[PDB]
Design a protein around this nucleic acid. Structure first.
Lengths: 51, 44, 82, 97, 209, 326, 191
DNA sequence: CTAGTACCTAGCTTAAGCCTCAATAAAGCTTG
RNA sequence: CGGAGAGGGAACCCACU
């Protein structure tokens, strides 16, 4: 399963346009994680104004 | 195995009877049946 | 693209930081002239780190946009992360 | 090996006292390679003919002798998996054997 | 068995009218959200051999910007509609100055009629729908996000902004229910507004192929 | 009662390899109003969904040769008072399933008459006697035809419910997300515990198109069926939900970045691009790239035959040639 | 339709053969005699209700030779004439099917009894009177130790030795001068 | 005559090709 | 004489994490 997942996404990367495109420049996401943000620099937080 | 199964394998094999090429001019055969296996101790 | 039309990030990404440091310390190892006065350190990687911190590396980065265009960002001109 | 059907590999209930439950390789041969219990002994085989002559002389009938009229109430005797005959009294033949 | 069929036809009409409103055709609110009782009193409660029968319960609407392009819908009485039972609709197509219409069939349409609908498509861009398929407005479902059809000028603006060619966008096949619901040819991208659990709202663009 | 939902690695396989036949396709059907509030109307919705053949309701079936329908070889005064073929059919139902699913002899007879036309007449006992009898004749290859039609009618008749959904469960959910959530007049959330019902089959379209069934929240746990019914964007969200369900079932956390990227690259082409050699090699990525995965003979001969050119813009393409991968 | 027919795929037979045809080929012309070998108590109608769907499948074969022809047509080596299929299917029934119950001149009654027992066992599982046998039950397993393994392999090598003693004997008796069994025996093969 | 050595000859799944079945329009009667 | 090191391969089995 891991190898099959990797071989389907191994060329998907964030370009200098800040968008996410595969090897053939087809756009997968306009921003990485639909926010453009790195996954290693985020935290868990609470929305105070909610409920 | 070496006591009885080899004996039964060597004895239940059918005898072979073999003729010539059906004639020579314008054919008898034989049976060659064998039994009673013997086994000896290792030798070198 | 012209200097007016620069849409890429002004932050030097970690990959640019790694590759610029490697390719500049390699030049220092091949006896390229240093851009910063050293205090006796002999390791080209530390020399390249000092040059990067002082913003004196004589290298610019060509960032290829997906459409095919590119931008020339000078190492002195964009923000270093660390 | 390398098969996703874990049913053959599992320790079966009938492994009590004949196959060691603990001992098996941890690799791709779990449950497939199994050792032998201590007092577990493997039968070596013998001719069933003496059992046949012993059986045919108490009160049982071979298949050729009887009709299937009386075969439903009696019990079927198998020797090495071949249906040898029919006996009216299972008890006191089990005890005799 | 007429209450169930009347309710089914009422929901079909409601979904079709909502489809027209979403597609852009002019519909009043009164017909947009009418209860089952208005449908009963206006059509007749007796789909079996009665006055709420098909063919003169059909809807015609017009676009908001100009009342020139008009869109009929048609509910054939035949379960499996055929060429002879759609050539009549095509004759109406021609005798009116209309361009496109819908066909909400009762059972599966015949392949000959499907091939016809393919063949006169450039002259008359008409498409089909199923009786079963139109008992729910799929856009109302929680899984289906907000789909918005882009106009050509803003498609060009999108392409010029992102400096990407037409085929590099994420795409959508014309046969899937949302694209068939709106009614849209190939080479026509759709704004898709969906909520993001990471950062608020996210806009994605799917092109029809 | 229905926790055979096959979570874990098998569900991950069923999602990655988008399979037409999952092991446990199931609905999560919600209810609209007062039926969601009380159990009796929930049961009424339940019986209209659970598929029911006439095997489920009958006790035993028997055929006789009555020379005269007036003769009534079986002593039944109901036929005497009620009253052209001599070979007839007789089936005995049971009160248990009959009153469990709320049918009538009239409904069963009209179902028979609609399915088979006026080729046979059903004579059913009234719902007053302890015994539940309906007799079948054939109006005017003589009795084996009756035998075959008896088998056909027992196998598939759909007295109530819809096809392909065999068993439906009913329970009050405990988890807040599965529970209905509203907003009160003072801006609270007021987790409501209303009746829901889960199935073991999947239709997703004959279900939502039913009275008193909420066509806004009914997920079907079936990616292909969702693709056929709701469309590719709803597929992405449902696939994300089912892919997050298996990961968060363990209590572990995976950042939404990766789930979103996977569900996007699996659905960025408008069709369900299952991650196999049947979905990854079909996209025009490049013969060199796709000759590294479950391939490297058919792909290469196909590329040679069609004169395909590899732009060498991938990663596993520049890796082969000993070049800097982008 | 009718439903629940009983078939018996047979060694050296490409297609499945209905069991009643197998019994008629084995030698039972009648039908009561065949049912006497499967259902042992005729007062059980549940057994009859499931055995008659297989009975009515084969009411076109009534004698032994047509059933032999039917089996021979399905054989891997289909005979060109009727009397060749007859002999081929008779050989298959005599030796290939159920060797352990006996291979002799007349073992048809014993083979029929055992096959009817097999069918009865299948019906008992179909009705639920009994339960399905377990594959992992090591009562159903046998262990091939050094004895049985060496027997299985020595038997094949011994046959190979005989089928080369025969070749040497043929090569000398075609000319017919004489032959020597000492040279004929190839001691290399077994060891 | 024989030997030594040199030359001749367990399950899965999914697409994918292959086998049969029901509308349908041409082809020709058919009587209005 | 030159420092020569490059030292087949296939198959199966066992075992390690």
């Amino acid at each position: 399963i891991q190898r099959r997942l990797i071989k389907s996404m191994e060329s998907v990367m964030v370009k200098y346009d800040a968008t996410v495109r595969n090897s053939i420049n087809q756009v997968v996401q306009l921003r990485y994680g639909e926010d453009g943000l790195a996954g290693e620099s985020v935290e868990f937080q609470n929305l105070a104004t909610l409920k | 195995f070496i006591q009885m199964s080899v004996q039964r394998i060597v004895e239940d094999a059918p005898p072979i009877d073999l003729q010539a090429e059906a004639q020579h001019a314008s054919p008898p055969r034989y049976l060659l049946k064998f039994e009673q296996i013997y086994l000896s101790k290792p030798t070198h | 693209q012209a200097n007016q039309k620069r849409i890429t990030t002004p932050y030097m990404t970690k990959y640019e930081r790694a590759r610029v440091l490697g390719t500049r310390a390699l030049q220092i190892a091949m006896c390229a002239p240093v851009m910063v006065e050293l205090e006796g350190e002999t390791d080209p990687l530390l020399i390249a780190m000092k040059e990067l911190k002082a913003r004196k590396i004589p290298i610019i980065i060509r960032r290829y946009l997906p459409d095919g265009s590119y931008e020339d960002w000078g190492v002195d001109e964009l923000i270093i992360s660390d | 090996r390398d098969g996703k059907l874990a049913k053959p590999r599992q320790l079966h209930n009938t492994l009590w006292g004949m196959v060691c439950p603990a001992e098996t390789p941890e690799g791709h041969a779990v449950g497939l390679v199994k050792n032998l219990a201590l007092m577990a002994y493997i039968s070596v085989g013998s001719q069933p003919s003496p059992i046949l002559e012993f059986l045919e002389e108490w009160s049982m009938e071979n298949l050729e002798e009887i009709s299937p009229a009386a075969i439903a109430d009696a019990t079927k005797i198998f020797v090495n998996g071949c249906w040898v005959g029919i006996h009216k009294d299972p008890e006191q033949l089990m005890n005799t054997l | 068995d007429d209450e169930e069929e009347t309710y089914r036809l009422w929901k079909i009409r409601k979904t079709i009218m909502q489809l027209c409103h979403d597609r852009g055709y002019l519909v009043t609110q009164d017909e947009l959200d009418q209860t089952l009782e208005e449908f009963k009193a206006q059509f007749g409660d007796k789909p079996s051999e009665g006055r709420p029968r098909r063919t003169d319960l059909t809807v015609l609407v017009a676009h908001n910007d100009d009342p020139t392009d008009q869109m009929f819908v048609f509910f054939p009485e035949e379960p499996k509609v055929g060429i002879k039972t759609i050539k009549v609709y095509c004759q109406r197509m021609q005798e009116e100055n209309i361009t496109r219409a819908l066909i909400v069939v009762q059972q599966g349409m015949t392949p000959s009629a499907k091939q016809s609908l393919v063949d006169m498509a450039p002259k008359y861009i008409l498409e089909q729908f199923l009786q079963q398929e139109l008992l729910i407005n799929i856009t109302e479902h929680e899984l289906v996000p907000e789909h918005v059809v882009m106009t050509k000028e803003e498609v060009t603006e999108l392409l010029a902004r992102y400096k990407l060619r037409e085929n590099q966008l994420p795409r959508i096949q014309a046969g899937d229910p949302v694209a068939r619901y709106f009614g849209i040819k190939r080479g026509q991208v759709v704004k898709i507004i969906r909520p993001s659990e990471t950062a608020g709202r996210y806009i994605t663009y799917r092109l029809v192929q | 009662s229905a926790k055979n939902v096959t979570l874990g690695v098998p569900r991950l396989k069923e999602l990655i390899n988008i399979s037409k036949k999952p092991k446990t396709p199931s609905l999560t059907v919600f209810l609209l109003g007062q039926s969601a509030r009380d159990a009796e109307r929930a049961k009424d919705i339940l019986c209209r969904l659970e598929h029911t053949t006439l095997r489920k309701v009958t006790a035993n079936t028997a055929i006789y040769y009555d020379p005269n329908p007036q003769s009534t070889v079986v002593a039944e005064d109901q036929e005497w008072v009620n009253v052209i073929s001599p070979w007839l059919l007789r089936v005995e139902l049971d009160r248990k399933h009959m009153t469990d699913r709320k049918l009538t002899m009239e409904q069963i007879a009209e179902k028979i008459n609609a399915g088979f036309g006026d080729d046979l007449n059903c004579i059913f006992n009234d719902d007053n006697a302890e015994k539940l009898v309906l007799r079948i004749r054939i109006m005017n290859d003589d009795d084996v035809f009756l035998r075959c039609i008896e088998s056909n009618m027992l196998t598939d008749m759909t007295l109530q419910g819809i096809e392909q959904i065999s068993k439906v469960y009913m329970h009050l959910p405990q988890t807040d997300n599965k529970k209905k959530i509203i907003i009160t007049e003072d801006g609270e959330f007021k987790a409501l515990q209303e009746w829901i019902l889960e199935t073991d089959g999947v239709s997703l379209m004959r279900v939502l198109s039913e009275k008193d069934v909420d066509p806004v929240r009914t997920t079907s746990n079936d990616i292909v069926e969702i693709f056929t019914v709701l469309g590719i964007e709803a597929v992405r969200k449902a696939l994300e939900r089912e892919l997050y369900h298996v990961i968060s079932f363990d209590g572990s956390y995976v950042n939404y970045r990766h789930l979103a990227l996977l569900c996007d690259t699996m659905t960025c082409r408008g069709h369900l691009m299952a991650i196999t050699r049947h979905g990854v090699n079909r996209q025009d990525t490049g013969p060199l790239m796709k000759c590294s995965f479950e391939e490297t003979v058919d792909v290469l001969m196909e590329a040679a035959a069609h004169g395909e050119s590899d732009p060498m813009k991938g990663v596993s393409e520049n890796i082969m040639l000993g070049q800097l991968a982008p | 339709a009718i439903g629940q027919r009983i078939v018996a795929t047979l060694p050296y037979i490409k297609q499945e053969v209905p069991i009643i045809i197998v019994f008629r080929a084995l030698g039972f012309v009648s039908d009561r005699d065949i049912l006497e070998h499967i259902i042992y108590d005729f007062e059980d109608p549940e057994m009859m209700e499931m055995v008659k769907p297989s009975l009515d499948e084969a009411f076109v074969i009534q004698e032994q030779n047509v059933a032999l022809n039917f089996i021979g047509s399905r054989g891997a080596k289909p005979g060109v004439t009727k009397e060749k299929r007859i002999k081929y299917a008779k050989e298959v029934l005599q030796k290939e099917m159920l060797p352990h119950v006996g291979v002799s001149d007349f073992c048809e009654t014993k083979k029929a009894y055992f096959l009817g027992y097999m069918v009865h066992r299948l019906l008992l599982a179909a009705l639920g009177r009994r339960e399905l046998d377990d594959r992992d039950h090591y009562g159903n397993k046998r262990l091939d130790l050094a004895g049985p393994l060496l027997a299985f392999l020595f038997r094949g090598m011994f046959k190979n030795l005989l089928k080369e003693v025969r070749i040497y004997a043929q090569k000398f008796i075609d000319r017919g001068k004489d032959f020597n069994l000492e040279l004929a025996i190839k001691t290399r093969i077994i060891s």
